[PDB]
Symmetry: C3
Subunit: 267 residues, 3 copies
């Protein structure tokens, strides 16, 4: 089965066991899994039961949310754990076949812009791929998109205006800047963070960019919000630590959920 058939086999499996035509995809990262656990009349598809899914826990949650039919990944597949870029982004392809037209991606990142504070929410206006790989390398899947997809509106400008307008109505302070993905799993060095600032990055992370590339190629609109869980490694004298990342993510979590619940109602 070519990668093309393997994607379709996973989609026909879910479609044959689903009452839903989900229109919004959710890749929740910054501890926003609580959003998935509030989906109504949910169907659950764990990854190990879906054919051709990446192996080794997480699950797909499909159901109702603020009048929208959604599908959400609980756990994410990461490039630093050893998965290929094709395995990392396969759930996005299956999402397209389930009917997804708008993808909402959230993550946790380190603030490179010295004007940010941990806890801030940065709408992703653009990204820099600094990992050394590309998920579209290989034979093009013509049933999904063109060989040379455009990336001038990777994070839909009109959707970004909607988030800003929604955040203003709710009184939620929001930032907007360029996200940069490193492969990981090492935290960046102080010199690499200064390099990221020079290249134009406002935040650094280890995800998001692969699925945003595939979602655009598959004909989806993409909206991305990154939660600054820490200052990037070079800016403060304290060492970076993942227990600190989850903690800061948990502090501003409720505001993040409120912002993300309102956009899905209004998309």
């Amino acid at each position: 089965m070519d990668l093309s058939n393997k994607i379709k086999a996973a989609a026909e499996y879910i479609k044959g066991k689903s009452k839903y035509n989900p229109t919004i995809g959710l890749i929740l990262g910054s501890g926003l899994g609580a959003i998935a656990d509030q989906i109504e009349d949910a169907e659950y598809f764990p990854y190990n039961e879906i054919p051709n899914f990446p192996v080794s826990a997480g699950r797909l949650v499909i159901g109702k949310f603020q009048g929208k039919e959604v599908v959400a990944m609980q756990g994410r597949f990461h490039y630093y754990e050893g998965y290929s870029m094709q395995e990392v982004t396969c759930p996005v392809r299956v999402m397209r076949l389930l009917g997804v037209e708008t993808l909402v991606v959230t993550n946790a990142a380190g603030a490179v812009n010295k004007d940010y504070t941990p806890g801030d929410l940065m709408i992703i206006s653009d990204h820099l791929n600094l990992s050394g790989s590309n998920p579209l390398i290989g034979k093009n899947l013509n049933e999904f998109g063109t060989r040379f997809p455009d990336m001038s509106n990777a994070y839909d400008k009109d959707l970004r205006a909607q988030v800003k307008d929604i955040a203003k109505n709710l009184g939620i302070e929001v930032r907007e800047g360029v996200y940069a993905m490193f492969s990981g799993p090492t935290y960046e060095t102080p010199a690499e963070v200064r390099m990221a600032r020079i290249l134009g990055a406002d935040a650094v992370g280890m995800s998001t960019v692969p699925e945003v590339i595939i979602a655009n190629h598959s004909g989806m609109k993409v909206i991305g919000v990154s939660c600054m869980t820490n200052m990037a490694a070079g800016i403060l004298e304290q060492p970076l630590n993942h227990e600190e990342v989850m903690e800061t993510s948990a502090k501003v979590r409720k505001t993040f959920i409120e912002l993300m619940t309102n956009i899905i109602k209004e998309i």
Copy 2:
């Protein structure tokens, strides 16, 4: 590797056994630029799917014959790293052309103009390059019959030959630019942020090719001239999506001037 070396020589011996020519000039043409191969005289034709160990495509051909007093072999169609080939698969035809006798390589490509003073249709003499792809064609065991383990890259695009191209274009009235070409892996078009980073790194043009061939060319002992056609302004400069149909149309509108430059270059080389 020995397997690669065997398969490279097996491809060249196949071509040599069926060819009348001993070419010294090589050409690598990137799609909307392959029409100059149609002007090679009494040409021989070798489709890639008939040459042993040539990478299978997802139908490009070698064109060998006379051109402006020289004997040339032109790659009508090149293999790209974004299609899934390894770096060694992408560049192994350059090794084949070397065993064919090629001493000077003319690399052409289509690229997006990062320099805001450039215009779609301009021709850029590649003076240097930035490898931003995340791979190197020489990683692995060295092919000792072709070059050294640590090849120098200080004159990758021959300075004397760039000066000869600048004088030929001046003699013909052809405006030519000269700048640095950056290669991304592809097949995505760069984001506006990646284009601004490309300018910060010192790049005047962005493309998805050239760099791997130039590395293997210089490693093999060949001189290289790079002429990149500005088929579009790089992403984010204008308020337009980037489209492969635009790349093809601009390549087609500048073909006449591009043929006249290269035709004279090959004669005076």
Copy 3:
């Protein structure tokens, strides 16, 4: 079917059962500096092609006494440009940790991007940039060595770096300090890529060191990096780069380099 975790265990098991030593300092020498390992006394030799699961060549481990310390030296390292994976390149560091190594001393030869330097200078590495395109920690995390997301704010120990500078001052050895950028290789950089490297904040460009430093820090080891500027980085001068001259410049200051290395190992 033996996982990476047990392959490293078997390598350490093989060396341990054949060694009376528990070295605390690891030496990845490469700026020539093979004489350092020659001066290891009462030494035990472990050829690479005899340690189980070590990467295949086309080198040896030296363990013994040095300046009051018990050390294990890597005589000849594995490079990413030769085709080894990032895990094959750094596997000896995992083995060195199981042998009890607490501090890693990495030397190399690099091209000087900073125009202040002159060929022959010695630069303490204060930080690095990974421009190779890979990372030796990508894959399943080895829980017995370190954490999933290791911090890299002190990749080259600051207190140790100051001790080198004190030792270099009492010895009268000139010393620079700057950032090391690792390209993949094996090509020498282009003049544009060198200009890019400086814009990125790099003072030297090389083809190694970065993978070992990442794995050493992940395993809980302190790292000292010393780079010898064997040449001006490409484009800085109007002459080509080649390996014969890198080795000539490494040879011209081996004595001075070796005074520094013998003294720091003594005072660590």
